[PDB]
């Protein structure tokens, strides 16, 4: 849970600007858009990184390249690599980070409009963020369905297969016989309707607040390299302040910077620490963290 700054440079002044904006607009809410960066401190292994036990197990299993684990065609031809990744990444194996708890604090303070996440770890929900405020753009393991006929299956059927040694006899649909898989969006598949639908509604909400207070969209720990999720930032209203907390400037913040863009090069957990400080909520935060 302990963090430190990424470099000798201080980001407290930049983080202070954010707290100042929220101070001047006490009845405004914030929309977060997050990626893998906010869960790195949780110890979740990056399947694309050698030196991770997961990477080598997938390589030993003949996975051709990391992302084939999230490819429909590959899964149907050989589901073992995905099952192996699921065993290691299944929700419940990790604990939320300081940044995940920040989302909870904001909710408690009624300043959370929505959190759009590309992650499948569901640590936002595990941390106590309400279902209504979360948009898991790439799905999660909480639901399962047959890839052929769409029949619904309880998530526990899939989960029970992961505890077997070795993992074999994968879940097959008792209607059409095809493989059943967790509701995780694989490369090549459309995201769930709720993604576009909610962004449609939040986009109007954003544009309408510009004319009344002022909202704020904060992008954290994402390389903005996966679409359509990566299109959100450019679609934020020109008149709505965009904030980016990432080790490096990426996506629209790099391709089309905006005068009002606030860029903060900092670890998501350190950022959380500094924001809570500048907001004066250290007391409530500590309570949540110790709860």
């Amino acid at each position: 849970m302990a963090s430190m700054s990424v470099s000798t440079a201080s980001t407290e002044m930049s983080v202070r600007k954010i707290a100042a904006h929220m101070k001047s607009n006490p009845n405004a809410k914030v929309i977060f858009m997050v990626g893998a960066g906010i869960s790195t401190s949780c110890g979740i292994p990056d399947f694309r990184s050698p030196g991770t036990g997961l990477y080598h197990n997938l390589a030993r299993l003949k996975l051709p390249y990391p992302e084939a684990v999230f490819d429909v065609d590959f899964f149907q031809s050989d589901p073992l690599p995905f099952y192996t990744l699921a065993k290691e990444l299944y929700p419940g194996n990790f604990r939320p980070s300081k940044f995940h708890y920040l989302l909870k604090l904001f909710q408690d303070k009624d300043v959370l409009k929505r959190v759009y996440t590309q992650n499948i770890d569901t640590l936002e929900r595990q941390a106590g963020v309400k279902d209504d405020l979360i948009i898991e753009a790439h799905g999660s393991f909480a639901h399962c369905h047959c890839i052929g006929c769409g029949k619904v299956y309880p998530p526990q059927v899939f989960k029970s297969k992961l505890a077997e040694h070795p993992i074999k006899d994968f879940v097959k649909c008792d209607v059409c016989g095809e493989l059943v898989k967790p509701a995780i969006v694989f490369f090549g598949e459309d995201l769930p309707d709720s993604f576009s639908e909610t962004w449609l509604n939040d986009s109007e909400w954003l544009r309408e607040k510009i004319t009344t207070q002022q909202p704020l969209v904060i992008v954290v720990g994402t390389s903005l390299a996966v679409y359509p999720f990566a299109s959100l930032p450019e679609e934020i209203p020109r008149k709505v302040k965009r904030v980016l907390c990432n080790l490096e400037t990426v996506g629209d913040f790099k391709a089309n910077k905006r005068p009002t863009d606030l860029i903060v090069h900092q670890y998501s957990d350190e950022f959380a620490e500094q924001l809570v400080e500048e907001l004066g909520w250290q007391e409530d935060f500590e309570k949540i963290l110790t709860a």
Binding site: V185, F187, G188, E189, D190, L191, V226, Y227, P228, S231
Partner: peptide, 7 residues
């Protein structure tokens, strides 16, 4: 909607 998940 935006299309299918991709790079």
């Amino acid at each position: 909607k935006g299309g299918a998940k991709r790079h």
